[PDB]
Scaffold this active site. Structure first.
Site, PDB file in Angstrom:
ATOM      1  N   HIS A 100       0.691  -1.221   0.110  1.00  0.00           N
ATOM      2  CA  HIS A 100       0.165  -0.141   0.003  1.00  0.00           C
ATOM      3  C   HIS A 100       0.756   1.341  -0.021  1.00  0.00           C
ATOM      4  CE1 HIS A 100      -3.511  -2.219   0.287  1.00  0.00           C
ATOM      5  NE2 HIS A 100      -3.235  -2.852   1.501  1.00  0.00           N
ATOM      6  N   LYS A 106      -4.165 -10.091  -7.564  1.00  0.00           N
ATOM      7  CA  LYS A 106      -5.026  -9.369  -6.433  1.00  0.00           C
ATOM      8  C   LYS A 106      -6.091  -8.577  -7.114  1.00  0.00           C
ATOM      9  CE  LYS A 106      -4.891  -6.894  -1.971  1.00  0.00           C
ATOM     10  NZ  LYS A 106      -4.188  -6.049  -0.978  1.00  0.00           N
ATOM     11  N   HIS A 118      -3.783  -3.272   7.630  1.00  0.00           N
ATOM     12  CA  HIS A 118      -4.771  -3.579   6.566  1.00  0.00           C
ATOM     13  C   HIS A 118      -5.244  -2.148   6.149  1.00  0.00           C
ATOM     14  CE1 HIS A 118      -4.527  -7.695   7.645  1.00  0.00           C
ATOM     15  NE2 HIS A 118      -5.213  -7.574   8.816  1.00  0.00           N
ATOM     16  N   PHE A 119      -5.629  -2.416   4.855  1.00  0.00           N
ATOM     17  CA  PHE A 119      -6.336  -1.117   4.125  1.00  0.00           C
ATOM     18  C   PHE A 119      -7.668  -1.436   3.977  1.00  0.00           C
ATOM     19  CE2 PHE A 119      -5.765   2.718   1.878  1.00  0.00           C
ATOM     20  CZ  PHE A 119      -6.692   3.021   1.155  1.00  0.00           C
ATOM     21  N   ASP A 120      -8.654  -0.866   4.656  1.00  0.00           N
ATOM     22  CA  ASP A 120      -9.963  -1.056   4.666  1.00  0.00           C
ATOM     23  C   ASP A 120     -10.792  -0.414   3.530  1.00  0.00           C
ATOM     24  OD1 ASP A 120     -11.605  -3.040   6.321  1.00  0.00           O
ATOM     25  OD2 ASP A 120     -12.750  -1.279   6.754  1.00  0.00           O
TER      26      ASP A 120
HETATM   27 CL   LIG Z   1      -2.555 -11.525   5.350  1.00  0.00          CL
END
Ligand SMILES: [Cl-]
Length: 124
Positions: free
Chosen positions: A12, A41, A119-121
């Protein structure tokens, strides 16, 4: 083994450019960050801000994550981001992406000591 924090950075962060300057950015970046190795992805956002600015989000507006956990944070301000989404024709291993440059708030999940994005939400 990559830490969750390091995986977040790899997937990211793109501090090296202020914005995507071409429609091919995502094709270029998804490949090189090795996000098309095993499979394409499907969706992935890159953030064009300093690592410090992105980490700082963990101290900002606490919100629920999509998954119902409450360790997510929305940035007070907008950030320069690029949204990468695989086209409907894309097939591994010829992964292809639509590039959308934008200025939006980011939402990340944070964990650990130090308390950092893992994490990117979403973007808003
Ligand atoms: Cl993961």
């Amino acid at each position: 083994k990559e830490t969750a924090a390091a995986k977040f950075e790899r997937q990211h962060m793109d501090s090296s450019t202020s914005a995507a300057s071409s429609s091919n950015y995502c094709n270029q970046m998804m490949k090189s960050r090795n996000l098309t190795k095993d499979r394409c992805k499907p969706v992935n956002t890159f953030v064009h801000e300093s690592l410090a600015d992105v980490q700082a989000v963990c101290s900002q507006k606490n919100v629920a994550c999509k998954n119902g956990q409450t360790n997510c944070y929305q940035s007070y301000s907008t950030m320069s981001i690029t949204d990468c989404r695989e086209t409907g024709s894309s097939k591994y291993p010829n992964c292809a992406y639509k590039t959308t440059q934008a200025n939006k708030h980011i939402i990340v999940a944070c964990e650990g000591n130090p308390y950092v994005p893992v994490h990117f939400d979403a973007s808003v």
